[PDB]
């Protein structure tokens, strides 16, 4: 962040079940990195590089 104002704005709302709806709870929590449990993750391939 660049100053406090950017910080506390990021810090303002909780993520909690008591505080936010069940749906809103789920999209706020789903992690960025998601991988299948026991499958091969292969290096990316680009369309025409």
């Amino acid at each position: 962040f660049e100053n406090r104002e950017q910080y506390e704005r990021s810090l303002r709302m909780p993520i909690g079940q008591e505080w936010t709806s069940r749906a809103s709870h789920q999209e706020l929590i789903k992690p960025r990195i998601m991988t299948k449990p026991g499958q091969v993750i292969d290096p990316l391939k680009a369309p025409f590089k």
Partner: peptide, 28 residues
């Protein structure tokens, strides 16, 4: 700005959704 902008819609959409959940209230 983009990342900081984006979290603000995660703010406003969350609170607006919570306000919508004020409808399901079983009684008055």
């Amino acid at each position: 700005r983009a990342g900081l902008k984006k979290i603000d819609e995660q703010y406003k959409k969350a609170v607006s959704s919570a306000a919508a959940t004020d409808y399901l209230l079983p009684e008055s």
